[PDB]
């Protein structure tokens, strides 16, 4: 098994270059419903299962993070998937998004791919929201800070002022300055998230 070993190595590196995309559909089987048809001794699967492998790639550490998995199981009497056992943390709402896609019923594979892409966009948004504040810390423009699990509410320090931020999807909505120039500085930093990185050098120069 040498030529087959090289063929399997090419298969594994092809699995790797497909897995670098981020949204892959790995096959799966639940080991309880492996029923035997008793016609020839062979084994057929009763209820099909299809596993989604979400995988967000970071940029600061330049490595792949821990991949989150979603598992879908076909219902027994409807030919539509229902969300069996997902691993996404609960601040990203998963069941409501699965009810929202295609009116609740998911039949084809690309219909599941749309749901996987929506959850993927949410995860990459959370990851970039964490990364931009972590690199603002690593550039030493800000002092010690605290992050939430989703990086939607953070509180950092500047040279004099304690600043609280409540940020929505990749753009800042509510700010807080605490320690008539304070209101101007408050509304000035509002906006995008890289605009915060630009405007912090506008007031700390």
């Amino acid at each position: 098994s040498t030529s087959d070993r090289s063929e399997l190595e090419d298969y594994i590196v092809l699995e790797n270059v497909y897995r670098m995309f981020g949204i892959t559909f790995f096959p799966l089987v639940d080991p309880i419903d492996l029923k035997i048809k008793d016609a020839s001794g062979e084994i057929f699967v009763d209820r099909e299962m299809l596993g989604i492998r979400l995988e967000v790639f970071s940029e600061r550490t330049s490595q792949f993070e821990k991949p989150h998995y979603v598992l879908l199981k076909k219902r027994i009497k409807s030919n539509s998937w229902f969300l069996f056992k997902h691993t996404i943390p609960s601040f990203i709402d998963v069941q409501g998004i699965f009810d929202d896609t295609n009116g609740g019923l998911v039949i084809s594979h690309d219909d599941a791919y749309l749901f996987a892409k929506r959850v993927f966009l949410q995860l990459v948004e959370v990851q970039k929201r964490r990364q931009i504040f972590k690199d603002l810390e690593a550039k030493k423009i800000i002092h010690d800070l605290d992050l939430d699990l989703e990086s939607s509410m953070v509180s950092f320090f500047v040279k004099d002022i304690k600043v609280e931020l409540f940020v929505k999807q990749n753009e800042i909505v509510s700010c807080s300055i605490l320690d008539n120039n304070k209101s101007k500085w408050e509304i000035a930093l509002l906006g995008s998230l890289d605009d915060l990185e630009l405007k912090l050098n506008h007031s700390f120069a």
């Binding site: 056992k85 943390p89 601040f91």
Partner: protein, 371 residues
């Protein structure tokens, strides 16, 4: 009439002695320093007195007489700090009960609260009804917020049982301590009114059976990767089976291959040596009841579980009602399977341990919880 920290209640001294005797010496030193920095009574001159006392290796009794007889109850804030540090120290004494936070159509609402402005709002909402005092800190290990809500009554002020409400940081599930009196409903309803501030939130309870510790309820129903898998799917909550695509291919499960055992599918269990096969059988039981590979207890100990299996044979709804009990249910079930009493080929997923601490029915092969 919202009571501030400088007010002192009227409680028995010996029960505070019994509570403060359940703490080590360094947390007592930190408590004395913080209380003397905030309140004082009877600067740095009295600090070296305790610095020399802890250097000599004194017992806890003389230092607890020191703290109870330089302040002589202490105040409401000191009692809150004592009880909350006791909660941090021994977590096995309490009993939590989870509850979701719904709004509008039914979509869940993340709380995203801030510890500063929430406390005065909760206190000014509660003070229009009873005498109250709140206290909120952050757990040092787990990323949650524990809020201790204490209430009083007038026959000076007779204290009540302290009510705890544990907020996780980014989850729509809020734990509260198990009670059913009218004060518990008042505190939970007041929190449900004051946490919102933009659009109204309601608290539908997701469970009826209490669970023991805060690490257990955090791993079960907080923001975590183990929040839904919890059973034979525990491998996907830790990802110990795959590596990144930037890893080596020589150390890959596709290339190395895992040692497996041929399953049996005929009824060859009711008719009843080779230690490699014995080790593989124990590995099979470890796979089915847990993740990949003490030694019987699961990740989370579950107290009480009641199932219901409503199958359907020849258009007849045939119900059975399983009920369980004990300290850790699925660990004891894995132990009973380990003694070759339960055929692991026919153990379904809901019995195996998945959707843990959820006592619900089954209608045609898919679990659903109970209200």
């Amino acid at each position: 009439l919202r009571l501030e920290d400088n007010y002192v209640p009227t409680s028995d001294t010996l029960v505070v002695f019994k509570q403060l005797m359940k703490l080590p010496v360094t947390v007592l030193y930190d408590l004395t320093l913080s209380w003397f920095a905030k309140f004082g009574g009877s600067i740095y001159l009295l600090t070296e007195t305790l610095d020399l006392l802890i250097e000599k290796g004194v017992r806890r009794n003389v230092i607890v007489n020191r703290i109870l007889y330089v302040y002589w109850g202490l105040n409401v804030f000191q009692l809150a700090e004592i009880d909350c540090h006791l909660m941090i120290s021994k977590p096995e004494k309490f009993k939590w009960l989870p509850s979701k936070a719904l709004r509008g159509d039914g979509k869940p609402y993340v709380v995203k609260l801030q510890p500063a402005k929430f406390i005065e709002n909760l206190q000014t909402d509660l003070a229009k009804i009873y005498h109250c005092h709140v206290y909120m800190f952050k757990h040092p290990s787990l990323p949650v917020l524990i809020t201790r809500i204490q209430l009083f009554d007038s026959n000076p002020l007779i204290s009540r049982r302290p009510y705890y409400v544990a907020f996780p940081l980014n989850s729509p599930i809020i734990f509260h301590s198990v009670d059913k009196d009218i004060y518990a409903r008042l505190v939970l309803q007041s929190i449900s009114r004051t946490i919102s501030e933009r659009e109204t939130i309601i608290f539908k309870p997701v469970q009826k059976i209490p669970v023991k510790s805060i690490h257990n309820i955090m791993t079960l129903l907080g923001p975590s990767r183990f929040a839904e898998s919890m059973g034979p799917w525990e491998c996907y909550a830790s990802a110990n089976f795959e590596r990144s695509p930037l890893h080596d291919y020589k150390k890959h499960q596709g290339l190395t291959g895992k040692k497996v055992m041929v399953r049996e599918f005929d009824d060859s269990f009711l008719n009843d040596e080779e230690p490699e096969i014995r080790r593989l059988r124990l590995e099979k039981n470890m796979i089915k009841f847990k993740g990949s590979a003490s030694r019987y207890s699961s990740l989370v100990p579950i107290e009480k579980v009641g199932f219901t299996l409503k199958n359907e044979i020849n258009s007849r709804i045939i119900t059975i009602k399983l009920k369980f009990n004990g300290n850790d249910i699925f660990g004891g079930l894995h132990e009973l399977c380990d003694k070759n009493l339960i055929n692991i080929d026919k153990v379904p997923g809901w019995l195996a341990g998945e959707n843990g601490s959820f006592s619900g029915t089954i209608m045609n092969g898919d679990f659903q919880r109970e209200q």
